[PDB]
Design an enzyme around this catalytic site. Sequence first.
Site, PDB file in Angstrom:
ATOM      1  N   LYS D 156       0.818  -1.204   0.000  1.00  0.00           N
ATOM      2  CA  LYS D 156       0.000   0.000   0.000  1.00  0.00           C
ATOM      3  C   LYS D 156       0.855   1.259   0.000  1.00  0.00           C
ATOM      4  O   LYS D 156       0.607   2.190  -0.779  1.00  0.00           O
ATOM      5  CB  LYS D 156      -0.934  -0.038   1.201  1.00  0.00           C
ATOM      6  CG  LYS D 156      -1.912   1.096   1.310  1.00  0.00           C
ATOM      7  CD  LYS D 156      -3.039   0.755   2.272  1.00  0.00           C
ATOM      8  CE  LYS D 156      -2.553   0.385   3.661  1.00  0.00           C
ATOM      9  NZ  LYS D 156      -3.673  -0.123   4.502  1.00  0.00           N
ATOM     10  N   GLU D 182      -4.704   6.333  12.838  1.00  0.00           N
ATOM     11  CA  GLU D 182      -3.927   5.123  12.639  1.00  0.00           C
ATOM     12  C   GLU D 182      -2.733   5.074  13.587  1.00  0.00           C
ATOM     13  O   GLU D 182      -2.514   5.962  14.411  1.00  0.00           O
ATOM     14  CB  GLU D 182      -3.471   5.011  11.185  1.00  0.00           C
ATOM     15  CG  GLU D 182      -4.284   4.028  10.366  1.00  0.00           C
ATOM     16  CD  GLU D 182      -4.204   2.610  10.897  1.00  0.00           C
ATOM     17  OE1 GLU D 182      -5.250   1.929  10.944  1.00  0.00           O
ATOM     18  OE2 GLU D 182      -3.092   2.175  11.265  1.00  0.00           O
ATOM     19  N   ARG D 183      -1.970   3.993  13.469  1.00  0.00           N
ATOM     20  CA  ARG D 183      -0.890   3.715  14.398  1.00  0.00           C
ATOM     21  C   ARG D 183       0.303   4.628  14.148  1.00  0.00           C
ATOM     22  O   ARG D 183       0.638   4.944  13.004  1.00  0.00           O
ATOM     23  CB  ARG D 183      -0.473   2.253  14.282  1.00  0.00           C
ATOM     24  CG  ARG D 183      -1.596   1.272  14.489  1.00  0.00           C
ATOM     25  CD  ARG D 183      -1.248  -0.103  13.998  1.00  0.00           C
ATOM     26  NE  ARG D 183      -2.413  -0.971  13.924  1.00  0.00           N
ATOM     27  CZ  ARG D 183      -2.662  -1.832  12.945  1.00  0.00           C
ATOM     28  NH1 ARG D 183      -1.827  -1.969  11.923  1.00  0.00           N
ATOM     29  NH2 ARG D 183      -3.760  -2.564  12.991  1.00  0.00           N
TER      30      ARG D 183
END
Lengths: 458, 485, 52, 469
Positions: D156, D182-183
């Site tokens: 991705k 997100e992380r």
Amino acid sequence: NLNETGRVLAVGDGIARVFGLNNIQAEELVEFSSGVKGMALNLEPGQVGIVLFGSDRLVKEGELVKRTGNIVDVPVGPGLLGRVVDALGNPIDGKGPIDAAGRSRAQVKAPGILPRRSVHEPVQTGLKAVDALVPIGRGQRELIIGDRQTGKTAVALDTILNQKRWNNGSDESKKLYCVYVAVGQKRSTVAQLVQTLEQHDAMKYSIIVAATASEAAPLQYLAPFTAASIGEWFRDNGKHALIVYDDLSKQAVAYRQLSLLLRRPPGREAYPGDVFYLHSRLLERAAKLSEKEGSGSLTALPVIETQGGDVSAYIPTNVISITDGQIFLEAELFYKGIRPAINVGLSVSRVGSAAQVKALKQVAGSLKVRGERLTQLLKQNQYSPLATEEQVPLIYAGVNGHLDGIELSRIGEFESSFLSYLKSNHNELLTEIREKGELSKELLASLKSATESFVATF
Amino acid sequence: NLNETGRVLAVGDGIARVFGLNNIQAEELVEFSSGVKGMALNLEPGQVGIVLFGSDRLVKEGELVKRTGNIVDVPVGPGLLGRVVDALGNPIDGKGPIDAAGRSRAQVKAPGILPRRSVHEPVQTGLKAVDALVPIGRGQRELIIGDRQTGKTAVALDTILNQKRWNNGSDESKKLYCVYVAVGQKRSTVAQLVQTLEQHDAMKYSIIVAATASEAAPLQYLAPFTAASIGEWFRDNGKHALIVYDDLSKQAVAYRQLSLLLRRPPGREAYPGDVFYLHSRLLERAAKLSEKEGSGSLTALPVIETQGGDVSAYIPTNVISITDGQIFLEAELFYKGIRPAINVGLSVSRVGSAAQVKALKQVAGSLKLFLAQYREVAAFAQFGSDLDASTKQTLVRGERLTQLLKQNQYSPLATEEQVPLIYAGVNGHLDGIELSRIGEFESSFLSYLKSNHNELLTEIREKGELSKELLASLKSATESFVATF
Amino acid sequence: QGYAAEISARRNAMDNASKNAGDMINRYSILYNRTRQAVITNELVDIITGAS
Amino acid sequence: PITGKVTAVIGAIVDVHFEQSELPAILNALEIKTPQGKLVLEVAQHLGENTVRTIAMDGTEGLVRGEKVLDTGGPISVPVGRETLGRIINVIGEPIDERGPIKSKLRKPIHADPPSFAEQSTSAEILETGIKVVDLLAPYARGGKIGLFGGAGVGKTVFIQELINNIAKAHGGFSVFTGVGERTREGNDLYREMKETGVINLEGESKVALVFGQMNEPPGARARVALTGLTIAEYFRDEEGQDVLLFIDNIFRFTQAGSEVSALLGRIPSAVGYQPTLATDMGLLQERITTTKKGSVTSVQAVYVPADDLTDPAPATTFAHLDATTVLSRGISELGIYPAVDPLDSKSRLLDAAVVGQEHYDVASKVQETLQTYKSLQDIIAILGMDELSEQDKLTVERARKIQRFLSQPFAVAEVFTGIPGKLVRLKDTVASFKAVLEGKYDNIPEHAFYMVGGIEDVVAKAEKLAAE
Ligand SMILES: Nc1ncnc2c1ncn2[C@@H]1O[C@H](COP(=O)(O)OP(=O)(O)OP(=O)(O)O)[C@@H](O)[C@H]1O
Ligand SMILES: Nc1ncnc2c1ncn2[C@@H]1O[C@H](COP(=O)(O)OP(=O)(O)OP(=O)(O)O)[C@@H](O)[C@H]1O
Ligand SMILES: [Mg+2]
Ligand SMILES: [Mg+2]
């Protein structure tokens, strides 16, 4: 002067609480100093509750609110033809102002039992399958229901496009003006739809009411009612109108929002209890009137998006209860290449044959290896509507059996090669089928002489 | 003086409402006259909502409340090594006070993007099923998920017990200090866990933060964050810490209670809105730091108890989304005698494969595939001779491999002892041994290499990677053993 | 020849059977998700009405 | 500036009282001059008694009642322009890369009003990406929304980096990335990968501006990061006149943060648990990603699907806006065909004969039919062997496999890892090449000549290179 002016006590969640406005009417439109409009939804002692037709940023505590002196109303008239208008009737196409013939309330009752008449004159969609198996009449409510990417909008857009051959003719009673209510749709999709209608010249007789997803939930809620009040002018002045709602699922979502933010207790599917009343008083306005009123009609084609293809959901079931039929577009057929994906089984028009053209009822013999080629023939390209003098032969050759001998991949070419030939040589029969609308048995035989000849010549 | 003091207006369930305390800070610790203390979670225009760390019985209407001026904080330092502390840092092991090297707040911001670094060092669990197929890296967040009595506490505790190979050495860079946050656990379970640790001498490098089921919900909510604040000392001082939360579902339950009694609006599953912001704010304080910051780390092994093995639930979904992997323990394998019951198909480490030990990677690369094929053929097995030879070979291998990956608890194995066994297996040398005797094989094999090929184990652990020559010597020793076994 | 025929017809029959099982799974996988959404919505309607 | 005082602190919600009777407008930004950095609060409601209810963008711990609050006189303003390139910005517009201030001369509010109906593009058009599979079988819309599916191992981030480079070379357009909820470790991985690839260059001209909210941030922050990245993209659009990519990762986290904020503000939760304002909150963001006479903002959005239910309100509302979808699959990577785009599960509304043209539509349709039939017989092919087919089905399989490896492409960003030279393939060249393959004009060239070459003119040279070998 607290009688005609007020001051905002509070503002939040799209709802504004205002002091004063003592003499305010229920559902009255109010103007804030910022120009943002609101609707007086609930009146209490010493405070009034106002839904905002706009972003709540435009309103601040202490700001003055003025009565416009009028229930929520929309401009109406023939000057709206060719225009795009927001839910409140303000032009958004920039072509200039609206030459309104008058103003009419958004919330107005449907006509009762006595003013109406039976639906008996057709809405020619140009689509073989609808015109032939699930006819739509003038004065009917016919739901287009389906899943995402299933042809919903294209059916109504073809119905709009096909009317140009009558809207151009001098006969005022065959014309059908069009209204398209884009609720929740992206401004881009609406702009492309508008350009499509314009390049097919369908805009001369179409009105677009746009309450897009960036529009506050109250405006999505309101747009259909004003579009209906626009159609009701053509209706009430003897003219025929068609209204497409794309789509009511998002009006329902917007009403759920507006309600839950007013602490209205949630019912099934978290929807408020009065969603049925949200839609019923909208769709009941689609009525065919008597010669005592002037023979007008408003035809409603509401659109619904079904999650996972389930028709047992709350809003779909409600609109199925309100409406007089449904055209169910199934995704399995769409992917298979059956476009339009009419599930002829679940589809039904409970008025049915009364509106259908006599030619097609005479010809079809209730069409609801041979059937596979029939399906292939029912397939239709987008933006390619057919006339009834062209549909009659296509159903004729397949019902009487002629087509069973032609290769399957080649049916699509018979359609093109037959109607051309029938036009190049046999226009007389087309003129008769068009003008008379009902086949004489001798013309039945003329059509047999034509088909049994051309099939052999193919 | 209504700035420094206040009066209680109402006492509910673990909740109190106090007039005054104007100058009070949000999340500040307060002490009631009776000695019970609590934290001010809700500040209102004319009253303060304080959650009590004890029984309501100790608070009455009209009672005076005094503020400490201190936001909820926990002592930190090395003095905590070997201690059992409550969520606020009070010792409960019965031994004396703690020589804290300072104090640190519970709710403190996780380190951002820039100061972090790629997780590149191994957290050696000593469990063959993990180090080989779902490796953990120093800086990782790794969820131990599974139904009750499936081996979660055992996995974490074996990871803790194994580090004594290093924490007694002088290389400060390889040590891994440990923290166990017993949330909602029985007090007897924590006592016998402490005893299991003290028998194996693991305690001197472990810290137990205990918020048991009989202790107020606020303490169960706080304990994970204070254990994090304890480990963060090691993270920030260039040291390496591991934190095992057993278990966070009960923290979510404590937070639900705490919020519903405060009358905060609930959401899904009766949980408050921001439970995701509870577990993320807890977990992603785990990190591997850059050289600019001392290159410490803190590693998080959260435990989640899944009812009926369903991972569709709200809190499990959230934690599965927050973490860098999961170790899935299945009851179906547990009661069939597999121990640890690690589902190799659902377990995943998205980070640690870069951190894994090279000796183990070289030999175990193919174990994923062999096991994935065995997991298919297992359904067809019971039929018999009808099976093709290209599947009979799979059925022969995977049985020995599954019997290899199982091991008894409180027996964590060194990498030098793990790589030879995975080698014998992947290279099919165990096929000539009855499946019932693999345990006899392993226990014997270790003794042979240790007694007759120690140079190779020494080199394996000194270098960490197998030379062209070491693979050959290992093949020779493995075959000479299997032949004469 | 009968033994061969019955094995072949026990390999095609179970193929059709497994594919029909797959179609039934793909239907119940929609029914399940619908029931999931409904259950959550209603549990939360109850909680909210209790909290009002 | 107009001064107020805090009165309540309930989690992330803070009530402020303004005695002067000059109140701040909704969505305006108040800031408190706390130690360890000032804290921003966004006005959510006017409650009365000159009291305003606000959502905090950072942890509310340590706030006292009576703490002074200042009205900034507008919504959260963020810097814009070239200076934002190669830098990491938080929702409240501060540098968190620690390379110093963003000395931009302009700052713009994130709560802009989307373009009018009169300013939309009247007709759709394709944003040529340079990637064969997308540009042929699922083209991206100019001003549209593109949903990217897939997790780990499917490449991705390299796909995103390649989109950035291709847009910056072909169209001259810069890019913005927003990490929504997100992380943090993955954002550091993205930052270091971008430094190595060359889309960030601290000593030169960077191509991508980074905005990073993350899970550690309160729900009120997650709910607004996307608007900051969108404002940077809109500034590159309206002033510089560019076609600007806006990556959002992940959008479901925008929806979830909205649900959390709604729950905290007391609003009654709707269906399966999302905010009642879901559709409008998604729209206010998405309908600003649109083409105008100045330019276009095109959005690539990672779309997580809860419980794999494409009918959960969040997926449904997201999909209602998406103009294209791109599915990255572990299965296509196992076949070694990077960038792993499934040519059959990816789709686009703009793949119609009106938009792309018949020259394009016919090739795309024929290619999808070839691969669909190959997949439809991809089992008996193994049971009965390729020889047992019909000769026509055999030819279709030989075309299918050749096309399948012809959809592969080498990326110029991955050069520093794969060692292969990367290439662009224009839309004309892609369509003409696949027509030439469909017509059989290059049947006699072995399959491997299509693996990671680019266009057909390079299939020629690779066939010659195999001939030399
Ligand atoms: N009769 C038809 N024959 C062939 N193709 C069609 C036909 N009608 C529509 N299409 C194509 O299928 C697509 C369907 O889009 P459509 O107009 O159905 O949107 P919708 O389903 O009404 O709205 P949404 O897709 O947002 O739910 C269009 O891209 C169009 O090109
Ligand atoms: N690898 C193993 N070999 C043999 N027995 C084991 C193994 N792992 C766990 N057990 C046994 O299974 C039980 C597991 O309890 P454990 O300490 O794992 O708590 P748990 O699985 O988290 O259960 P709970 O959810 O109740 O804490 C214990 O009785 C232990 O003896
Ligand atoms: Mg549509
Ligand atoms: Mg346990």
